[PDB]
Structure formats: structure tokens, C-alpha cells
Amino acid sequence: TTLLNPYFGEFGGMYVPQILMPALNQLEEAFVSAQKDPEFQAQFADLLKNYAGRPTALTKCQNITAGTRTTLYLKREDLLHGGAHKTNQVLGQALLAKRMGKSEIIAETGAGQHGVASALASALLGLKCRIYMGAKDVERQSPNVFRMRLMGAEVIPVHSGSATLKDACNEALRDWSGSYETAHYMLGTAAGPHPYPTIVREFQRMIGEETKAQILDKEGRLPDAVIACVGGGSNAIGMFADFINDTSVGLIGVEPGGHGIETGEHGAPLKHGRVGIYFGMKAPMMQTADGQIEESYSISAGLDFPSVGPQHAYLNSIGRADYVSITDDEALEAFKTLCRHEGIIPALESSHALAHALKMMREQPEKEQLLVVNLAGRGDKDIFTVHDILKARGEI
Amino acid sequence: TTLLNPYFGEFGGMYVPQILMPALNQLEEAFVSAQKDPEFQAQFADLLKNYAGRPTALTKCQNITAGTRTTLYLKREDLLHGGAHKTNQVLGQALLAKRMGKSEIIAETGAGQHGVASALASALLGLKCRIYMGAKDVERQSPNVFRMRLMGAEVIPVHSGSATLKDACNEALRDWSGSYETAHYMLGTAAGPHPYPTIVREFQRMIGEETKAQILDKEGRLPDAVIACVGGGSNAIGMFADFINDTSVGLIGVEPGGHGIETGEHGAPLKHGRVGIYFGMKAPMMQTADGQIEESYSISAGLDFPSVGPQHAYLNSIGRADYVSITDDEALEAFKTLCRHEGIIPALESSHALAHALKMMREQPEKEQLLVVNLAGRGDKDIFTVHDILKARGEI
Amino acid sequence: MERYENLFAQLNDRREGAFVPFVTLGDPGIEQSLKIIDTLIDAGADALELGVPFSDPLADGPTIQNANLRAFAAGVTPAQCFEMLALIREKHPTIPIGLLMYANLVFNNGIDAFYARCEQVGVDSVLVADVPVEESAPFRQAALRHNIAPIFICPPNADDDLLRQVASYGRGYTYLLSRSGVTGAENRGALPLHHLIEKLKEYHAAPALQGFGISSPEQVSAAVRAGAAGAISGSAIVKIIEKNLASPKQMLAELRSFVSAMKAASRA
Amino acid sequence: MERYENLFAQLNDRREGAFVPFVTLGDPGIEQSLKIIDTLIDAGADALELGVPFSDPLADGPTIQNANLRAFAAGVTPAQCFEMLALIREKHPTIPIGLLMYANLVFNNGIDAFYARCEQVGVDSVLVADVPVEESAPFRQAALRHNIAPIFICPPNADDDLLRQVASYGRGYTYLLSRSGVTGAENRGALPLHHLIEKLKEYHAAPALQGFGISSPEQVSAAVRAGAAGAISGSAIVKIIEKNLASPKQMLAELRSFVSAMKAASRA
Numbered sequence A, B: 001t002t003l004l005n006p007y008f009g010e011f012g013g014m015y016v017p018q019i020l021m022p023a024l025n026q027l028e029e030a031f032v033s034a035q036k037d038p039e040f041q042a043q044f045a046d047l048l049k050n051y052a053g054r055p056t057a058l059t060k061c062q063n064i065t066a067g068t069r070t071t072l073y074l075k076r077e078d079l080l081h082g083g084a085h086k087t088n089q090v091l092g093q094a095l096l097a098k099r100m101g102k103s104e105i106i107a108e109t110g111a112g113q114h115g116v117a118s119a120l121a122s123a124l125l126g127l128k129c130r131i132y133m134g135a136k137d138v139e140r141q142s143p144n145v146f147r148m149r150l151m152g153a154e155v156i157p158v159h160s161g162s163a164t165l166k167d168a169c170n171e172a173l174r175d176w177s178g179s180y181e182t183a184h185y186m187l188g189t190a191a192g193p194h195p196y197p198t199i200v201r202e203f204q205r206m207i208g209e210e211t212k213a214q215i216l217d218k219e220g221r222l223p224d225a226v227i228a229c230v231g232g233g234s235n236a237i238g239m240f241a242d243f244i245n246d247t248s249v250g251l252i253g254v255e256p257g258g259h260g261i262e263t264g265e266h267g268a269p270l271k272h273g274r275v276g277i278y279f280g281m282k283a284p285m286m287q288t289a290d291g292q293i294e295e296s297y298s299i300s301a302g303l304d305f306p307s308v309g310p311q312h313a314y315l316n317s318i319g320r321a322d323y324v325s326i327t328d329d330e331a332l333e334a335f336k337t338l339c340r341h342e343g344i345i346p347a348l349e350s351s352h353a354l355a356h357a358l359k360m361m362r363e364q365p366e367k368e369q370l371l372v373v374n375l376a377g378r379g380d381k382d383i384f385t386v387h388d389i390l391k392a393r394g395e396i
Numbered sequence C, D: 001m002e003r004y005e006n007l008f009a010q011l012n013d014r015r016e017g018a019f020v021p022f023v024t025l026g027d028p029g030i031e032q033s034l035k036i037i038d039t040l041i042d043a044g045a046d047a048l049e050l051g052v053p054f055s056d057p058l059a060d061g062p063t064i065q066n067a068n069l070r071a072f073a074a075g076v077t078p079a080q081c082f083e084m085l086a087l088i089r090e091k092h093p094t095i096p097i098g099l100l101m102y103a104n105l106v107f108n109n110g111i112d113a114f115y116a117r118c119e120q121v122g123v124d125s126v127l128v129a130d131v132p133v134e135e136s137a138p139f140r141q142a143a144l145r146h147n148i149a150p151i152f153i154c155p156p157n158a159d160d161d162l163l164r165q166v167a168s169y170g171r172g173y174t175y176l177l178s179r180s181g182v183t184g185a186e187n188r189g190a191l192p193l194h195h196l197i198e199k200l201k202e203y204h205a206a207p208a209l210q211g212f213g214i215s216s217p218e219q220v221s222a223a224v225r226a227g228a229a230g231a232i233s234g235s236a237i238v239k240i241i242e243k244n245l246a247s248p249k250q251m252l253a254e255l256r257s258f259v260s261a262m263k264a265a266s267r268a
Ligand SMILES: Cc1ncc(COP(=O)(O)O)c(/C=N/[C@@H](CO)C(=O)O)c1O
Pocket: A084, A108, A109, A110, A111, A112, A113, A114, A115, A165, A188, A189, A190, A229, A230, A231, A232, A233, A234, A235, A236, A301, A302, A303, A304, A305, A347, A349, A350, A376, A377, A378
């Protein structure tokens, strides 16, 4: 029994061990309560403004669209404290933990951005934080691991399974199943069992709410489309939510195409995977023919979640939102383009969204279209990867 | 002949080769004109808000002051596009270049933050950018050099002299002396020949203007003191300017003490150097007994300018502002403290200012004082340095 | 079939609890696993719980995580597991065989098809670790259409509604969880369960087997004394496999000794 | 003294321009530098311009940057330079000796003291490269109190006021800059200067010497034909030092040949 429908159409649900059902019920009830509580909302607003720095800029990118009829704005989640949109919802989930009397935080992370965001919110709000991270990711993300540790979080490498994000997800749930009376699981994307897809959307929805206000102020109308990368789905649903009922506004989600869809080396389960049941939800998955969960591949570390939030699967099924993919090379080109033409170094993750916008523009350069790309993170973290690629190609 | 006094009391002036005097005169006249031009001001405001993301948050830091009568706020220049305050004044200087019909930008950089800021403003505004950087700094700052290059700037290692920032400063002036008809020298601190100390202050003054508005809104009174690190003086004068006539408000500048003032291995010329004439100005310098210019030493790369802005020397002489030093170890402790207790990773440069604030608090914990530290940059760039130090100490 | 019903009736007239080992199928290889399982039965196992190797066993502690990993290292697939299951049933007519599944392996090629294959090979029950009663409907319906007992978890955090639901929907046995957390011998339950056992009986639930953290004879005896129909032990058994990977002979000897001791403790 | 006045008067009655080499004192060492300078004089130099090694020579191109670096590599200090200057004057009674300074070396131990030391060793002029006329007052006042000619730069970008100021304040000679930029033989001036030369004469300025980018006899002759009193050559001389660091013999031979040729070109 729940207060809210745990499914978006056929997708979602609460596929956790029975032992965890009380925890999910408690979280749902605390969220529904918090959403009606002006004190909770004021505290969240205070953190978002004075600590995280909201509202974020909406930047018009004139150089990159010159000579076409595309107008392109970037929503600047890269300027948020922490350097990515992950900060928004960790502040809200940390307040929910306090609301429920929880004193400890568990989080999973792949690229380490969610881990850093969990750590900073926990340091600020006095919660003891433990972060699970696949051992292969720990090895590849030593800067983020060290940032988490400087902020006082315990980072626990996970050596089971494939030693990557799905394995960290499992470890977080294993811990929670035996610690839920005192610890809150701060899940890092709009996926997992209800009520997480709902909570994460609501605690990221200020992205699209601000974007709507800003674009109306600057252009006097809504966008023709808003475009965001989709790893697990949090930045995209945060951008999309406020526009769902504005049916003139296109919602475009961009999954990583990796080396190409046809190679199988990608991270695009919504369009090219198969529905399965894992990590508490029924949703499209990367998986083997016999149902073992597989990894997502991308040049961008942060698009590694091997499934996708159930609300995205739902919005796709009903045709409200459209989902596409962008390959590593397309993303890398968009990255270099934004650096050179706008002086903004984008995260390789959101470089996927920018790449699709550049495609929409270049393919039909006489089409009059007002686009917003969610720039969900900054790309300083990525310059080593890019350096290494460009060197290997003899570009430098 | 100039429009404005080139000196602050006995400090400052225009000590450049005769050939450059027309360039300085032109710049002064373009600045005075721009400051009266609502179109110029609107364009600058537009860039600051929509591109750089102003206004920046003013964050209250409750955890780090718990159990004392200090209230501490951080002005969050770390959240500015580029990750440091250098972005503010490069946008204004780039507009001044355009105002004068200049199409190329020359800049010097030590740690690379000013170089990155020059590069991003030049990319945005369509100016061809060349950046001089001492070869030893190029070697030690490969991430920043690569960021500059991704943004389309030419980065030119300087091998003359000590192959550090002062040598880059010289090279920038050598170039300008033969290219001033087409290029603008985008000097990166509140120092050098008039009119740069004046221009840089005015184009950084929004830091203190916002801080004043924000602190009045939140606390209903002005701060007891505002505290900023002093390398060349730009972030500090930007914080101080709007409070100069508020004589109840302390202005505290923090120079790097390095290994300790007594060791001679420091970067604190305002209090522990000797007045000289170099880089276009009469000001306190690091210099040998026989007048050769010396380097500044600090753990923090960005406090390497071996002199200090003349307005700071002036404000010190008249006793309007007070200048102190903080050692490497003090700065490192402040860095770790802010990470663990507030979830903010500060630049090692501004960690010097925070260290002095923590000292003011800890020394007199029952003193009721409302302090603002200018957090002029984020510290993600510094985590390798800190990692290496902590490892060498057997802290990790 | 009625394998659990028949077992529990027979045990009732031996005044005995059931002792039920868990192992992962194919750990540490197919042939050694088959020998392991025959050893468990010969030493006194009353029923079996058998895990199909899964990539993401999120209700399992490290001991059983490692068992899944060893079976994968041997190339064990679900299809091979079903071949093994058919052979186990072909050898042993009456012992109840329960599977420990995760939802994705059941859903993968269709829920109904999964349970149809279970019926074909002669499985008696399926427990899906990451499907709570709230989500159970298609799983329990498929189970019963194919003569498979759906095994429900009765957690120590159970309210009355859950007790009533598991009593009504379950067949075969009711899984009485010792404690919160995940599988593992290194953590022993510290919660008395006799009240839940009594309520399950009042509601005519399938007989209860206590599981999680059972590693010692005294815990088997305790389960019976509290009113449970028996006890399941997984990690303690799997640890013996892990300990003896380099001596299949010693491994079987130690499994036999352990199972014999644990089964002896089920005498009331 | 009146060394420049006497030189220019004598050159006027030889119908000759002045040829004035620049070198850095102590490049590539003190002893070799002294020999270099005596070679320049013996080969026909009419006056000298001599640089004191400075850490930050921001009006100099790479050739002279490297000369400063070589003198530093030899441990040359300002004090040693002043010892060298005293010895040069002790050898040569009438040749005008001008220093090329940067402001910090003049200010370091007091401006007045600097010029007093110049007077003591027998220097005739000082040019401070990073002090424009706007900032010149304490430097030119100290110079004149100590019988030292303050050398002002007349840039090609000069307006009438600047011409009048340099004419009024200067002594010894007026430095007529060939072009914008910094010192160096690799960039030749491309601006006619005869108009500035004429205006300086109208205003009774010290005689003009053209400097920057002078590397060839034709440029010396051109300076004289345009009305200048002579020409300064630095980088071209210093390049010969750089080229021949590994043969002091060949270095002196090539310096002598160069200076002789350049001085010959000063014949009107
Ligand atoms: C900079 C950046 N942009 C986008 C995404 C994509 O995440 P959504 O789809 O918006 O939820 C991520 C994800 N990172 C996760 C997984 O590795 C993590 O850090 O743990 C990211 O780091």
C-alpha cells in the first residue's frame, strides 16, 4: 500500500526485498508531508540559493549558431556549487533524512559526481556519509574520491560483480537493508524503486521552472525544445518536468551511443536495450540474452547507469518525449566546439545533449527553432580524457 | 598628461617605455568614457549576469564558527564562470578592447587562472588571444594551459629571466610595445601602470557592492571586517572598494607567508618587501639587495605576483586597510577545515583569507564579530597539491 | 505435486524439524556442484534451496556474492542450471527443491515461461528475493498455474496485514526472516520470532522455515523449539565450499559432517 | 664635463656622424667584456652605450635578454659594473659613456646616490628605459645635479608637446627611436624620421642619435643623410658576442670588422 502510484504506466514499481518496504513507505510519507510543509520548503530554498547558488544563468550562445535560424540557450547547472546538477536534489534528500530522524547517509556513485554532491550536503548538514563506488570506478576517478574524502565521507570500493556502478547500487541497498532505522539511502538519479523517481524529479524541477521563467523573459515564448542527456534521468527530468503539460514544447533526451548503437558498445537502454527488473524497478536495461545485467559504455563517465528512469520510459511510450543517441565522436566534437566558440568547457555527459542540438541546427539550418540545452555539469574534470584522445589521434 | 591622478599617494605611476604612453593614455580615456556610457554598462551587466552568473551567493558558515561569537559569511566568487573572480574584470576589459577597436588580446598569467579567464572572454567576444606564461609555470600548470588552448588561445611559454610570472609580465609588455595599435593588454591584477589599478578595481567592485547589499539584507548591518587574499590585489580591492568610505568596516588583506616571514621564503612584499619601480609602477616589491626583482613563494600558485597593487600600499600607509600574512601550513589547515565542515573546497589562495578569519575567531572566541571572507576561487585545481602534501606527511 | 506437504506431514510424525541447506548451482563448477548437492542429501538434508547465479544478488552478503562469482567463473548459465535441476530431480523423487531467484532472471524470457520450465524440471517452489508481496501478483499466479509454490518472506518487521497476505498467498513454506540485512553467517538474528510463528499458524500459513544467519546446531533446535517447521542454512554451507576449493575430498567430508550435525539438531 | 658637446663639435668639423655601439657590461664575463669594449673603441666607436644587467629588461628583445642572462651567469652585479665603468673611464679620457638603466636599479639605493656614483666613475649620460618624460622629474634633476646628461626618448609617435619637452629637458643627445617594439636587429625601422629631426633642431634639442634595429652601414649613412648626429647599434653587436662565445679571438676580430665598417659609413 502506498500514497502514490509507484508506476508510470507499466514502468517503475518497488522491486526490493520485503525487508526494505517499510523504509520506502516511510520515505514516501515523509516526502508527501515535506511537500506540504512551508518550513521544509523554506529551508530547501535557503540552501539552494545561499549555498548552491541558484538561480543558475540561462546563457544565449550566439557564436555557435551564427548563420542559421537556431537560437540556442544553455541552462547553466555547471555553475551550481559542486559543478553539476546533482547538488540540487541531494540538498532536498538530506533535509528529508533529517525530517525522518536519520543521521547517516548512504550513496552510490559511478563517475563520482553524485558521491561528491552527497558528501558536500552531508558535511554541511552534519550527517555521517558513506559512499559505495565500484572498485574500477574508484581507480579511474581518484580526483573525485579524494574530494569525497576531504569532505569527510567514507568511500568504500566495491569489488563484487563488475566492480562498477551497478555493483555499487547493489552494495548501497545491501547496507540500507540492515541500517534503514538510522540511515537514509540518497539515491543519485531519477530511477530505483518508488518513491525515488518521483522525489528526484521534484527536487530537480527548479531547473525547468527557472528555464521557463528565463526564456519567457528573454524571448517572450516557450522553447521549441529542451534537450538533456540521459544517464539515469535526473537532469533531464528536472529540465522536462515543468514543460510536460506545455505540449508545444519538445522534450528530447539523449542517451550515449558509445562506439555506435550497431557495435553494442553503448549506453542507450531506453531505445536499444530490453525491459528488465533490477535496482527496484521495471525499466529498459542493458542486459545479456539470459538476463544478466550489463554495463553501459560511453566516453563520458557519468552516463554509466545501465538502465533509465521509469518516467522517461513512460514519456517515451506515450510519445510525449523523444529519445535519441549521440556517439562518443559526436560528443567530443560538441565539447571542442563549445570550448572554442563560447568559452565554456562542458561536461562530456552534457556534451551529448549539445551534440544533438548542433545536429538539429546543422541538419536544417534554415529552420527557425528556439532550443535550450541543459548544461548539467562543467567539463574541467574531462580535460585529461580529451587531452589523451586528441593526442592519440595526432590532433595535438 | 592624464585625466586621472596616476598615483595613490606615493604609489603607482606610469613607469613604461615612452613608446607605450599613448596606449595608456588611450586606455584611460576609453575607460573614463565607458564609465559614463549606459550602453557599455548594460553590455557589461548582461555578460556578468547571463554568462558569468552574477550575482554570486553569500554563504553563511555556521559549522565552522559553532561555539564562538564569530558569524562568518563567504562571498562565493568560486561559483563564477571560470571558478574564480578573474572572470569579472576580463569581461569589462574585453569590452574596452572592442570600444577602442582592438581585435587582439595579450595577457600574462602565473597560475593560469587569469589566462583561462582571458581565453574564455576572448572566445566569447571574438578576439584573438595570446597568453604569456613563464615556462616553469607552463610545466607546472598543464591543466590550465590545456584549458586555454581548448578555448582557442595561443599560449606562449616564456624562457627568459626566471621563467615565471614576472617574466611573462615583461613579455606581455614587450609584445604590446610593438602591437598596441591592434592589441589590448588585458592585465590580470590591480597593479601595473595607470590606468590598470583603477580599471581593475572598478571592474571588480561588484564583489563588495553585492556583499554590502547581501549582508545588510541578512544581518541588518555592515560587516565588522571583510578579508581577502592579496597576490596582486584584484579580488581584495574588488571586495574592499565599496566599503572604503564605510570607515567602521575593517579591510584586511592577507599576503602569503610561505614557509614563514623569517625564512625569506614568502610572498608578502607589502609588509615585508621593499618599495621599488617595476612593471610600470612604484610599489613594494620582492627584490634582492641590489635591486633585481625576485619571485614570490607560496604553497598557492596564484599568490605569485612579486609586488602588490599601489592602492593597497596606499590604503595601508594611511591606515585604512590592514595587511597580514598566513603561512602555507595555516592555509592548508583552513583548506581542510572548510572541506570537512562546510562541504566547500576553497582555492589555496583564498584559503589564506579564510585562515586569517579562523585566527581572528579562535584567538578571541568570545568576541562578537561579523566577518566576510572573499572566496575568490574554487579549490578543485588544488587537490593534487594537497594530496601530495598530506601523503608526504603520512596523513594519508 | 505436494512435496512440501508430504515432507512436513512426515516430519510431524517423526517429531522433527526440517533442515534445508542453500547452495548456488554450479559453484564451484557444474560437476562439483552436483556432487555437493548429492552429499547434502545423503547427509540428511530434508529439502534444498538452490540459487541460480545472478549478476546482481542484492539480498546476499559476501559469502554468497562470491559463490555467484565462482559459478560465473565456471561459465554457468541459467540454462545449464535448469539442466542440473532436471538431473537432480531425476535422481531424487521426493525431496522438495526450492529456487532462490532474482526478478530479472524470472522476467527475462517471460514470467509464465519461467514457471513452466520449473514445472518441467520438477522444481517445487520459487522465492524471488527482490519481489515483495506488493509486487508479487504475476509471479505467484504463474507459480500456481504451474504447480510451483510461491515462497513469501515474513520479515521480523511484519504487521498483521502482511502476516495475513503471506498466509493466504503462500504455499510450500513461509520464509521466516531472522533479521534485517542480507544473507550471511557472520550475523546472527537476535529477535525472538515465536509471536510471528504463532500468528502464521493462526492464519493457516504454509509451515515456517527460519532463514538468515543460521550456522549452528543450537539455532536449528531453537527454531524448532520456537514452533517453526525447520531452518535454512546458506552461508555456513557455502563457506565450507569456499574454504575447501583446493580439496574436493575434504570439502565433501566437511559438508557431510556439517549437514549431519545440523539435521541431528532438528530432533524435537 | 662636456664630453658629448665636445664630441659633436669635433664630428661636425669632421663632417661625420657618431657611431655608438651598445653592449651589456659583464657579457660574457667581466674580463672579456672589458676587452670587448676596448676593441669597440679601438675600431672606431665615437661613444658607448652600456647596459647594467637587470632581471627584467622589458624594453629589450631576445638578443639583449640573452646578454643580460649571460652576465648573470657570470655573477655580474651592479657594483661590479660600476668598478668596470671606473676602469673604462680611467683608460679613455674623452669618449662619452652612456648607461642604459632600468628604473629599479636607479631607485634601489636612492636616485640621488645612483647619479652621484655615476659622476664619481665618470659616466656622461643615463637613459632609463622604463621612465617616460611624464615620470622623469627626479631622475633628470639628480642627473643634472651630478653633471650627468638625462637621455630622453623621442618616439616616432611623438607630438609637438613631447618634442618640446625632450628638447628642453634633455642633454647630451636625444634618442631618436626608429620604430615601436623592443630592441633587436631582426626588425628594421620603416618610418622616415627627418621631420622629427628637423623639429628637434628647431627646438634646440641635444643632437639626435637614431637607435633600434640599426645593423647595417646603409642605415648609418641614412641616419646622417636624414640630419641625425649619428646612430646606435646594440643587438647587431651583441649577436657577434653570442655567435662567438666559443672563440674570444674570432669574437674580437668580427667586432672590430663590424664597428670599423659601421663607423666608416658615418662619413657624410
Ligand atoms: C556530470 C554528470 N552529468 C550527467 C550525469 C547523468 O546523470 P542523470 O541522467 O542526470 O541522472 C552524471 C551522472 N553521474 C552519476 C553516474 O555516474 C554519478 O556521478 O554517480 C554526471 O556525473
